Amino acid sequence: GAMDEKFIRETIETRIMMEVFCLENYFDKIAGSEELLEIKGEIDDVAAREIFDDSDERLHKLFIRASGNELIISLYEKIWDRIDLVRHLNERYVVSNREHKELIERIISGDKEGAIEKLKEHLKNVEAETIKNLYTY
Amino acid sequence: GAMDEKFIRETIETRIMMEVFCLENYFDKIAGSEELLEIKGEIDDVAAREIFDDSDERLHKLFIRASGNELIISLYEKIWDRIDLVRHLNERYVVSNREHKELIERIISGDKEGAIEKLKEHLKNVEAETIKNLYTY
Secondary structure: OOOOHHHHHHHHHHHHHHHHHHHHHOHHHHHOOHHHHHHHHHHHOOOHHHHHHHHHHHHHHHHHHOOOOHHHHHHHHHHHHHHHHHHHOOOOHHHHHHHHHHHHHHHHOOOHHHHHHHHHHHHHHHHHHHHHOOOOO | OOOOHHHHHHHHHHHHHHHHHHHHHOHHHHHOOHHHHHHHHHHHOOOHHHHHHHHHHHHHHHHHHOOOOHHHHHHHHHHHHHHHHHHOOOOOHHHHHHHHHHHHHHHHOOOHHHHHHHHHHHHHHHHHHHHHOOOOO
C-alpha cells in the first residue's frame, strides 16, 4: 500500500485503541510510577525538540508497559516503527509537549476521565494536523 | 515463555482491548452486516460443536473486520493462532453458543451498551473457566 491518509488514520486509531485501553485500566499504576515523574521533569525543563523525541516515546510506551501484558507490549513494539514514521511526518513539538504536560498533570492529580479525554484529544489533534500538512511538503 | 495462566489472561485481555474497541466504534456497521445474520442463522439452526468452531471465529473476526482498519485486522490475524490455542484449552460449546446467540440479538436489536457488556462477560467467562480447568487435564 501507499503511505497515504488511510495509512496515517489507521496508525492513530490503533494507538487510541491500545493506549487508551491501557491508561484506563492501569491508571493508578501509571499515576504512581517513577517513570511518569521523570518524564514530567523532562518536560518541565523548558529546546522543545530535545524535550520532545525522548519524552513522547517514553510517555506513550509507559502507558502500554503499565499493563504488564507482554502480548500488548509486544504488539505495540511491533507497530512502533510505523508509529514513529507517522510521528516524523509532521513537526509539532511545542504543542505536543504542552498537551503532554497537561495530560501528565491530569494523571497525577487523579483526574482519570480528563486524562483519557486529553490522550484522545492529543492523538486526534496529531492526526488532524498530519493530514492537514500531508500536501505541504 | 510457558503456556500458563499469565499467557491465557494476556490473550483474553488483548481480545477485550481489540474486540470491544471495534464493537463500540463500528456498532452500526456490525449490526447491519449480512455476515452477522448468516452467523445468527447458523447458531439458530439448532450439534453444538459443529455450530461453534465456524461461528465463534467468524463472529469475533467480524467485529474486527468491520473497523476497516487494515492494521487492526492484521494485528488480530497475527494473534489468531494464539487466540485459537487458548480456545482449544477448554470446551464450552453449549454455553459459548448461548452467549453468542444473545450477544448477536443485543446487537441486532440496537442495544449497544448491552452488547458490549455481553461481549466482555463472554470473554471473562471463557477466561475464568479456562483457568479453573487448567489443572484438570
